[PDB]
Amino acid sequence: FMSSRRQSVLVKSNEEGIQRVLTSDYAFLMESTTIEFVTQRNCNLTQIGG
Amino acid sequence: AFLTVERMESPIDSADDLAKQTKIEYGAVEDGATMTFFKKSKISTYDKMWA
């Protein structure tokens, strides 16, 4: 699914993809405490999955 | 019960809807690029309707 549309869904940094999920139906396979950092810096995101 | 079944059977809006609801059949050109692409698709939504 990612290799079908590499020209669209691959984002360069962590911060440039937060604009993608806050404007469309985008999701992440990003990881670590980036998600745990952005969980409580704003109440507009949600970590899904273990 | 009838209105629950009717509201469950939603109209199709994308390819995954017709991949889910199998009441309406579908197909394409037999030896075109559409049948060529669906034979090698490993996405398991286009692959499911390819099957």
Curated annotation (Swiss-Prot), chain A:
Glycosylation sites: 44
Post-translational events: Sumoylation mediates kainate receptor-mediated endocytosis and regulates synaptic transmission. Sumoylation is enhanced by PIAS3 and desumoylated by SENP1.
Tissues in which the protein is found: Highest expression is found in the olfactory lobe, piriform cortex, dentate gyrus, hippocampus, granular cell layer of the cerebellum, and in caudate-putamen.
Cell compartment(s), UniProt: Cell membrane; Postsynaptic cell membrane
Residues bound to L-glutamate: 31
Protein function: Ionotropic glutamate receptor that functions as a cation-permeable ligand-gated ion channel, gated by L-glutamate and the glutamatergic agonist kainic acid. L-glutamate acts as an excitatory neurotransmitter at many synapses in the central nervous system. Binding of the excitatory neurotransmitter L-glutamate induces a conformation change, leading to the opening of the cation channel, and thereby converts the chemical signal to an electrical impulse. The receptor then desensitizes rapidly and enters a transient inactive state, characterized by the presence of bound agonist. Independent of its ionotropic glutamate receptor activity, acts as a thermoreceptor conferring sensitivity to cold temperatures. Functions in dorsal root ganglion neurons.
Subunit structure: Homotetramer and heterotetramer with GRIK5. Tetramers may be formed by the dimerization of dimers. Assembles into a kainate-gated homomeric channel that does not bind AMPA. Can form functional heteromeric receptors with GRIK4 and GRIK5. Can form functional heteromeric receptors with GRIK3. Interacts with DLG4. Interacts with NETO2. Interacts (via C-terminus) with KLHL17 (via kelch repeats); the interaction targets GRIK2 for degradation via ubiquitin-proteasome pathway.
Note: The postsynaptic actions of Glu are mediated by a variety of receptors that are named according to their selective agonists. This receptor binds domoate > kainate > quisqualate > glutamate. It does not bind AMPA without coexpression with GRIK5.
Family under the similarity heading: Belongs to the glutamate-gated ion channel (TC 1.A.10.1) family. GRIK2 subfamily.
Name of the protein: Glutamate receptor ionotropic, kainate 2
Gene: Grik2
Span covered, complete protein: 708 to 757 of 908
